Design a protein around this ligand. Structure first.
Ligand SMILES: *[B@@](*)([O])C1=[C]C(O[C])=[C]C(O[C])=[C]1
Ligand SMILES: *[B@](*)([O])C1=[C]C(O[C])=[C]C(O[C])=[C]1
Lengths: 277, 279
């Protein structure tokens, strides 16, 4: 039901209703044009109302991925790309400059449109802009946005793994190693994205996978289970126990913890050479 | 990676370390997802195995060449573990005509279980180091409920309280706060509302509110610019932003019914204002 304007790296989807001069609404944190539709039906007799889903939201869809660096606080890409999106939208719909209204961060997009592509702006309206760069109290509001984001992303995650570990009864040796941050601010944020991906896309899907004891017994001569000598009492040690109890597959003990192949690689290797040839 | 190999498979580019001579031994990483963690171990076995340590396709130096399917966020989707499992089977066949040695740790051992289930033709021997799979356990319900709970807790607890105090800092208006306190009417909407909000916090608010705009950039085009303040969002931080602009540039402010979300809270008074501005 939506219109489409295929751009570089995205199909931009937008509503279009009414008739008369083009007026483009840019959404804020909502990111989608549907929020403007009850306003649009009130305006359609006077303007060709265009309410855009910005490329990263809603019915829009990127066709190549975001640069990994878009994750970075002072990244430039998304906001310039969104502004250029609006410029191409206007140009595609109207030979003449159009009206534009942006709300909240969407009016920041509107500021970049009027900066980079003034030729498509006939009038522009900034509904309650939250930008702080030119404020005289700019560092205050920058630091605060920076701090609330750090707090929301990390603080919830750090407490959760801490209690999760004791629900699993994780050996101190692993828990020591697992929490030590990286030695690089880049190593630490790939480390956050890592654990965050793991929580959402791996642990539930993998630990409730369709594997039965039956499809272990088929190949019992090939399998060894392997328990850490530093991680006894932990949840994965019980899974191995249960498997061996019901199938007979043997449990070879091996130095280290859940991470023993990096904790005690030498002794880890010696056990593997023993079992295998 | 800086010394890594590549196997180009359906959907991704699989990067992996290779060291040593002899029988092929493939190591599958767990939660860290990358094979670099096996390298000191590999140095021990390099005289006896061709050690292959894998960056699984979503991690490290491997790269997807297709989008992850939408349904991979479902907690019951088979997709990722099957794809990893077959990523391994093709890696074996690409490296050896013989069946190979395989070791997986933690959720990497689960991947190895799916290699054995679906492609035992490639497994000479296999080892499961500390598997956390619960499906076949008689207390499987306990452990699956623990996983589902902790994950849902981590993904939401920080967000619920952080946005409450953030709005106190912004002095967000009641009409806006009552609205953004509302949950969507289905789980798919609540989840949608949640992904949107996490994306905005990570990829939008810091970038956009500190992007390169000076008041000079307004001065050129004062004739075109109108600024809009909700009559219902008084003393919220954006109004003070518009108050500063008007103070320093002379560009005027038009009051408009509703608050931060006024165009949908009061779309008839919003519309009426706009028609008098520009019609
Ligand atoms: B291995 O990364 C692992 C250990 C564990 O208990 C200590 C649980 C896991 O999944 C829930 C994974
Ligand atoms: B608008 O969506 C918006 C309002 C606000 O103060 C109430 C701050 C914002 O970002 C910092 C955005």
């Amino acid at each position: 039901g939506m219109e489409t304007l295929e751009l570089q790296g995205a199909k931009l989807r937008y509503h279009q209703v009414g008739q008369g001069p083009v007026l483009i609404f840019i959404p804020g944190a909502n990111g989608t044009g549907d929020i403007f539709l009850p306003l649009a039906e009130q305006l359609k007799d006077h303007f060709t109302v265009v309410a855009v889903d910005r490329r990263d939201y809603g019915e829009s869809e990127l066709t190549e991925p975001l640069p990994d660096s878009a994750s970075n606080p002072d990244s430039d890409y998304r906001v310039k790309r969104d502004a250029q999106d609006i410029a191409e939208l206007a140009k595609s719909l109207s030979d003449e400059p159009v009206y534009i209204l942006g709300s909240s961060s969407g009016s920041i997009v509107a500021m970049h449109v009027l900066k980079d592509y003034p030729e498509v702006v006939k009038k522009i309206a900034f509904h309650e802009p939250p930008i702080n760069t030119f404020l005289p109290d700019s560092t205050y509001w920058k630091d605060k946005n920076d701090d609330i984001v750090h707090q929301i992303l990390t603080e919830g995650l750090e407490k959760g793994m801490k209690t999760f570990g004791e629900t699993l009864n994780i050996a101190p040796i692993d828990a020591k190693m697992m929490s030590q941050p990286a030695d690089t601010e880049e190593g630490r944020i790939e480390q956050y994205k890592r654990t965050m991906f793991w929580l959402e896309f791996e642990i539930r899907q993998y630990t409730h996978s369709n594997i039965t004891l039956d499809d272990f017994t088929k190949y019992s001569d090939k399998i060894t289970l392997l328990n850490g000598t530093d991680s006894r009492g932990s949840f994965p040690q019980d899974v191995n126990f249960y498997i061996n109890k019901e199938t007979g597959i043997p449990i070879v003990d091996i130095p280290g913890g859940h991470l023993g192949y990096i904790q005690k690689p030498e002794g880890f290797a010696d056990v593997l050479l023993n079992m295998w040839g």
